[PDB]
Amino acid sequence: SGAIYVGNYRVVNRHLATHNDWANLVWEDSSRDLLVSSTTAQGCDTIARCDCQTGVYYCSSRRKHYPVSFSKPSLIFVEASEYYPARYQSHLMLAVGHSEPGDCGGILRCQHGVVGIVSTGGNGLVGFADVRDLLWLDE
């Protein structure tokens, strides 16, 4: 679990979005595993606008933050689940680090702010859905 609260927006993993999120839908993309819903209260997370390949993510299965090097956002193949058939997930960045299902939603940050959220993992790897290209979140 976990979300990004920026202005009048809430960003979550699409596979974990609630009935409230769907009844206040702004945008969603299955290929990215993202869903953005509207909020009445003002969010104070800052989104980074950079090309950083290093940062820190929160890992709930260890109650710890870890520093990581991560790849540039790309199309990476992801195996079937109760949420999605076998497919390429776009805007995904991989890093060598611990993750378990339950860690999805953990924020990844660099010195410029919020980079993205945990969305995939396994085999000593962790995948993050990038949010830095969604320029409309600030405006």
Ligand X SMILES: CSc1ccccc1CC(=O)N1CCC(F)(F)[C@H](C(N)=O)C1
Interface contacts to Zn ion, rule CB under 5 A: 48, 50, 52, 110, 112
Task: From 17-25, 34-42, 45-53, 75-83, give the range in contact with ligand X by CB under 6 A.
Answer: 75-83
* Of 44 and 80, CB closest to ligand X: 80
The β-bridge relationship of strands 125-130 and 87-96 is: antiparallel
Closest CA to 2 of 83, 92, 117: 117
* Partner that binds at residue 48, options ligand X, Zn ion, none, CB closer than 5 to 8 Å by kind: Zn ion
Count, residues near ligand X per rule CB under 6 A: 18
Binding mask 26-55 for ligand X (x = CB under 6 A): -------x----------------------
In angstroms, the CA 20 to CA 88 distance is: 28
Closest CA to 45 of 22, 11, 18: 11
Q: Catalytic residue at 130?
A: no
The answer to whether the CB of 120 falls within 8 A of the CB of 92 is yes
Query: Closest approach of Cβ 43 to ligand X, in Å?
Result: 23
- Compute CA distances 85 → 49, 80, 103, whole Å: 31, 5, 20
Give me the residues that bind ligand X (CB under 6 A), please.
13, 15, 33, 78, 81, 83-84, 89, 99-101, 103-104, 118-122
